[PDB]
From a paper:
A monotopic alternative NADH dehydrogenase (Type II NADH dehydrogenase: NDH-2) catalyses the electron transfer from NADH to quinone via FAD or FMN without a proton-pumping activity, and functions as an initial enzyme, either in addition to or as an alternative to proton-pumping NADH dehydrogenase (complex I) in the respiratory chain of bacteria, archaea, and fungal and plant mitochondria. A series of studies has suggested that [name], one of three NDH-2s from [name], would be useful in replacement therapy for [name] diseases caused by complex I dysfunction. We reported that the enzymatic reaction of yeast [name] has a ping-pong mechanism, as is the case with NDH-2s from Mycobacterium tuberculosis and Yarrowia lipolytica.
The crystal of [name]-stigmatellin contains one [name] and two bound stigmatellin molecules in the asymmetric unit. Two stigmatellin molecules, STG-1 and STG-2 are bound to the hydrophobic surface of the membrane-anchor region of [name]. The aromatic head groups of the STG-1a and STG-1b overlap each other, while the aliphatic tails extend to different directions. The aromatic head groups of the STG-1a and STG-1b form hydrogen bonds with the isoalloxazine ring of the FAD cofactor and are surrounded by W63, P92, A393, Q394, H397, A446, L447, Y482, M485, and L487 (site 1 in Figs 4A and 5). In contrast, STG-2 is bound to a groove formed by helixes α15 and α16 in the C terminal membrane-anchor domain of [name].
Numbering used by the authors:
A (entry chain A), B (entry chain A): 33 to 48, 51 to 146, 165 to 418, 426 to 513
Write the structure that this text describes.
Amino acid sequence: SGAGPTSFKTMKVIDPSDKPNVLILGSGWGAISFLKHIDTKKYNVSIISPRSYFLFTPLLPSAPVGTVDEKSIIEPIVNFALKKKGNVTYYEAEATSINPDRNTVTIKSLSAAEIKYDYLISAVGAEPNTFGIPGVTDYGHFLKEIPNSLEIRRTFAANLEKANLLPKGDPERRRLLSIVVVGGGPTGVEAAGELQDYVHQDLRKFLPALAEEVQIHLVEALPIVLNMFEKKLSSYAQSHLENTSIKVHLRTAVAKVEEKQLLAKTKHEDGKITEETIPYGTLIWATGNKARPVITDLFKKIPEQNSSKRGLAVNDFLQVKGSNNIFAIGDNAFAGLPPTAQVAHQEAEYLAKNFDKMAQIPNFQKKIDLLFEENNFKPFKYNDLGALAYLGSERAIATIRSGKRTFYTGGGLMTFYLWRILYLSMILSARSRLKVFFDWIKLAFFKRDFFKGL
Amino acid sequence: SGAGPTSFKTMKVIDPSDKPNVLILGSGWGAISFLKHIDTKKYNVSIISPRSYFLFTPLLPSAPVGTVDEKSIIEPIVNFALKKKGNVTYYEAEATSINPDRNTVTIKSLSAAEIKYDYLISAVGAEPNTFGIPGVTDYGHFLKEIPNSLEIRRTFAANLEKANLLPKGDPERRRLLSIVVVGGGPTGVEAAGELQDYVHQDLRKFLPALAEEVQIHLVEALPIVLNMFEKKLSSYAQSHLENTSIKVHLRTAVAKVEEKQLLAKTKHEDGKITEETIPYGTLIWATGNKARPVITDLFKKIPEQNSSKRGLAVNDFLQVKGSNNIFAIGDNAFAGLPPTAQVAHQEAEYLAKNFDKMAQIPNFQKKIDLLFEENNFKPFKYNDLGALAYLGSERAIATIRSGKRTFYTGGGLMTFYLWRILYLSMILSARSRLKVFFDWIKLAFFKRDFFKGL
Ligand SMILES: Cc1cc2nc3c(=O)[nH]c(=O)nc-3n(C[C@H](O)[C@H](O)[C@H](O)COP(=O)(O)OP(=O)(O)OC[C@H]3O[C@@H](n4cnc5c(N)ncnc54)[C@H](O)[C@@H]3O)c2cc1C
Ligand SMILES: Cc1cc2nc3c(=O)[nH]c(=O)nc-3n(C[C@H](O)[C@H](O)[C@H](O)COP(=O)(O)OP(=O)(O)OC[C@H]3O[C@@H](n4cnc5c(N)ncnc54)[C@H](O)[C@@H]3O)c2cc1C
Ligand SMILES: C/C=C(C)/C=C\C=C/[C@H](OC)[C@@H](C)[C@@H](OC)[C@@H](C)CCc1oc2c(O)c(OC)cc(OC)c2c(=O)c1C
Ligand SMILES: C/C=C(C)/C=C\C=C/[C@H](OC)[C@@H](C)[C@@H](OC)[C@@H](C)CCc1oc2c(O)c(OC)cc(OC)c2c(=O)c1C
Ligand SMILES: C\C=C(C)/C=C/C=C\[C@H](OC)[C@@H](C)[C@@H](OC)[C@@H](C)CCc1oc2c(O)c(OC)cc(OC)c2c(=O)c1C
Ligand SMILES: C\C=C(C)/C=C/C=C\[C@H](OC)[C@@H](C)[C@@H](OC)[C@@H](C)CCc1oc2c(O)c(OC)cc(OC)c2c(=O)c1C
Ligand SMILES: [Mg+2]
Ligand SMILES: [Mg+2]
Ligand SMILES: [Mg+2]
Ligand SMILES: [Mg+2]
Ligand SMILES: [Mg+2]
Ligand SMILES: [Mg+2]
Ligand SMILES: [Mg+2]
Ligand SMILES: [Mg+2]
C-alpha cells in the first residue's frame, strides 16, 4: 500500500489465514493499551496511525520548558509490537474514510489504498476544539502532540529574546512576556504551572528583570478550575495558582484572538458582563475536545450515529451503535464517561479480554449485541480510580479511590511526591520510565534545558 | 551593536574604565578554557562567537546515533560566564575582519559594528578541509558541530527507510546501506565505531535483514589509522575495526565524490595504484583542518603572517608573530603542536595565568615579546598527557603519560571503561557530566534513540 516509511510487519512467526483480521486505528492510549492486551495469536492484528510512537500525554505539559525532554515521554510503536507473540502490522497513515458497507478503511499517507478488516477498533482520539472562535488557529498553539511542545518553546524563547531588546517600561516588552493559557482542566493548569516554574526557578536566575515582568494568565469559562475534583481541592488549586502570580480568569470566555491581543468576556457572579482586551505574546489553547473528520464522516454512514456529536455512541460492550463489527474506545467514543487516559486504558483492557472470549465462540470467528448477551459477557463498568493535577511550585492535588471508597484526598508537597510516583508507575514502557526519572533527578540539581533549536 | 538575540552582559558588579579590554574570539575549547581561568576583575572580558554554547567535541561522534544526546554534550556560555566574579559580555556574531591597525574586530550576525580591544585572544578554531576534492560539500557531511550530528542522523535514517522498501538483492538497497567515513584519526574512527555499534547492537534487534546488509567503510590516506598512538595500538585498532566488519581502506585518497558513488585511489605498499568506485548512501568527511576566512584574511595584514598557511604563527608566549596585542590559541594557532582539545586547554590555562601576572606590571596596563622576556615570564611548554580513542564494540585504546613517563598504555575492555571515566572527568560542566552519565546508564539497559525528527 501507500503507507509511510515507518510502516512495518513484525515476523515472530511465519504467517500462512483462519484468524479474524483486527484493525486498530490510532497509536495512543486506547490503541496501545489494546495492543498490549490483545492476543496476536488469536487474531491478525494491524494498526493504522500517522504517529509511529506512543505519547505519554500526562507529562506533555512538562515538555515545552524541559521539565522532561520530548524523547522521554514517547515510545516507538514497534517496541510494543515486538513484545507480542504473533505478528503485528503497522501502516504509517491516517484513516480518511471508514467504510462499514465493505469492511475497509481508506488510508492516506502524509509521507506516502483500502485496508480490510473483520473487526475494527477505532481509537483515533479527538482534536482540540476552537469553538469557531476567530483567530485561535492563526495565532494560538494547541498542546496535544510533540510538535506543539517544540512550537511553544520556539515561540516563548523568541518572545523572551525580543522582549530583552526593549527598555524596562515598553508596553511591547510587557506584551511579549505575557502568556495566556485557555482551559482550566489539568492540561491548561499544568501548562501554566510548568511555565511559571521555568520562569521563577530557572529564567529568574540568569534574566531576573525579564522573569519578573512575565505574566501568565489562565482563562476558564466555568466558575472553577479542575471541576473533576472535590470543591476544596479546586479551591486549594486556584488559591495556589494565584499565590504563584498566575492571574486566573474564571467565568471567562475568549470571544476572539487577534495577533497581539485577545478579547476575554467575563460573566461575573453578580450577573454583569465585562470585556477585557488582554495583550499576549504566547497563546496556549488547552480546552475542548471535538470529533475528528474521519469520525464525523462515519456519523453520516450509520443511522444510529446520525445524531452523534461528541463521538461515536457505543453500547455496554463498546460496539459502535448500529455496527456488528466496529468498536470504539477513548476520546472518539461516547460512553457517558470523561475523555481521559484512565477511561481509554480501562476500555482497552476490557475489550481485549472480550476478544479472548470471542475466539472461543464459533459465531464470532466467521441486534448487534445479541451474541455478547446470549453468551453472558459482562458489560463494561468503568472504575473511577481518582484524579491527579500538578499546580506548579512543587504542589499537586490528588484524589485516589476505587469503587465507593476514597483511599486518599489532598494537596501539598507530599501530594506532589505522590503525583510523581504515580505518574512513573503509569508510564507504559520501562525506557520512558527511566528517562523521565533521570529528567527529574537532573532537575533537582540543574536548570531545565530550554533550547529553541533542540 | 548588531549582534544576535542570545547576546548578553552579565551584571555581577556595577561597571564604572581603568582595566584593559580583553576580547575573546570563539566559544570552544580555547575560548571557554580561557574564560574559566581569566580574572574578570583584572580585565573587562568580552566574547564574540556565533555559537552560544560550548561543545564537548570528543563525544560529538557519539551523538548522531544517540549513544549520547546532543543536549548532553553542550553547555550555554552564559552558565560559564555566571561563575565569574566580574562582568562578561557575549556578542552572538562571527568575527568577519580582525583590524590590527585600529584594534577592532568587525562582526556580522547571522541573526542580527566594530568591537574595540586592548588585547585580542583568537580561538575561532579551524574548519574541515575538503582539499578541493570535487563533490565533498555537495554530497558529504562534516562532523564538527551539533547541526552535523542532526544531519547525519536524518540522512542515515532516510536511507534505511528507502532501503527497507527495496528487495534483498537490489544494488540500490546495498548502496543506500553503505556508509563511507573519510579520516582515520579519532573523529573518523569513532564515527565509524559508533555507527557500527548502532547497526549491530540496536538496528539488528528490530531490522536484522537491513542491519546485516549495512557496510561501513573507513578511508584514510596514511598507511595506518590513529598515527598519534604507538604502532602496536594502531595495529590493534585496525584489527578490531576490521573484526567488527568495517572495511578499512588505508593508503587511499578520495579523488572525487559523486551523488551515488565516490572514486577512491589506493597507492598500495607494492607501488601499484588502483581505483575503486565505492557506491555510498552516507558520506561523513572527518579529516583535515584548514584556516577560516577571518584568519586567512589576517595573514595578509601582518607581514610576519604573510607566509602562514595552517594557522596564525605564535611565539613562546602565544602572541601572534608581528602583533603586540593579539594572541592565538587552539586550532587557529600554529605553535608546532597537534590540533587537539588537550593543546587548546593547556594553551588557554597558560595564557590566563600570564594575564594575571600582566596586571601586576604597569607597561602591560597602558620586539613584541620584550616585556615578557624582561619580566622573566616562562615560555609555554606543552605537556603531552597522552591520547584516547573509542573503536566501537566496547573497545578503546589509551596512552596515559606526563613528561617522559608513560603511566598506562593499552587496549581492550578495561581501556573502554577507562576511556569513559576519563572523558567524564574532562567535561567542563557538572550538568553536561551528569547528562552524559545518564545517557550511558540508559544505554546499558535500552536501545539508543535514533529519531529523525528529534
Ligand atoms: C496535554 C494533555 C495532558 C493530559 N493529561 C491527562 C491526565 O493527566 N490524566 C488523564 O486521565 N488524561 C489526560 N489527558 C487525556 C488523555 O490523553 C486522553 O483522554 C487520551 O489520549 C485518550 O486516548 P485515545 O486513544 O482516545 O486518544 P490519543 O491518546 O489522543 O490517541 C489518538 C491516536 O490516534 C492517532 N490518529 C489521529 N488521527 C488519526 C487517523 N485519521 N487515523 C488513524 N490514527 C489517527 C493519533 O496520532 C494518536 O496516536 C491529557 C491530554 C492532553 C492533550
Ligand atoms: C568530532 C570531533 C572529535 C574530537 N575529539 C577530540 C579528542 O577526543 N581529543 C582531542 O584532543 N581533540 C579532539 N578534537 C579536536 C578538538 O575539538 C579541537 O582541537 C579543539 O576544538 C580546538 O579548540 P579551539 O578552541 O581551537 O576550536 P573549537 O573548539 O572548534 O572552537 C572554535 C570556536 O570558534 C567559533 N567560531 C567559528 N568561526 C568564528 C568567527 N568568525 N568568529 C568568532 N567565533 C567563531 C566556533 O563557533 C567555536 O565556538 C575533536 C574534534 C572534532 C571535530
Ligand atoms: C482495589 C483497587 C483496584 C481494583 C484498582 C486500582 C487500585 C489502586 C491504584 O494504584 C495502585 C489506583 C489507586 C491508582 O492507579 C490506578 C490511581 C491513582 C489511578 C489514578 C489514575 O490512574 C490512571 C491510570 O491507571 C492510567 O492507566 C494507564 C492512566 C491514567 O491517565 C493519566 C491514570 C490517571 O490519570 C489517574 C489519575
Ligand atoms: C604528573 C601529572 C600532571 C603534571 C598532569 C596530569 C596527570 C594525570 C591526568 O589525569 C589525572 C592525565 C593522565 C589525564 O588527564 C589529564 C590524561 C589521560 C589526559 C589525556 C587527555 O586529556 C585531555 C584533557 O586533559 C583535556 O582537558 C580538557 C582535554 C582533552 O581533549 C579530549 C584531553 C584529551 O583528549 C586527552 C586524551
Ligand atoms: C536509609 C535508606 C534509603 C534507601 C534512603 C534513601 C533516600 C533518598 C532516595 O534516594 C536514594 C529517593 C529516591 C527518595 O527519597 C528522597 C524519594 C523516592 C522519596 C520521594 C520523593 O522525595 C523527594 C525529595 O525528598 C526531595 O527532596 C529535596 C525532592 C524531590 O523531588 C523534587 C522528591 C521527589 O520527587 C520524590 C518522589
Ligand atoms: C560493593 C560496593 C560498591 C560501591 C559496588 C558498585 C558496583 C557498580 C557501580 O554501580 C553502583 C558502577 C558505577 C561501577 O561498577 C560497574 C563502574 C563505575 C565501574 C566501571 C565501569 O564498569 C562497567 C561495567 O561493569 C559494565 O558491566 C556490565 C558496563 C559498563 O558500561 C558498558 C561499565 C562502565 O562503563 C564502567 C565505566
Ligand atoms: Mg489511540
Ligand atoms: Mg495522544
Ligand atoms: Mg479514541
Ligand atoms: Mg485524544
Ligand atoms: Mg574556542
Ligand atoms: Mg568545537
Ligand atoms: Mg583556535
Ligand atoms: Mg576547531
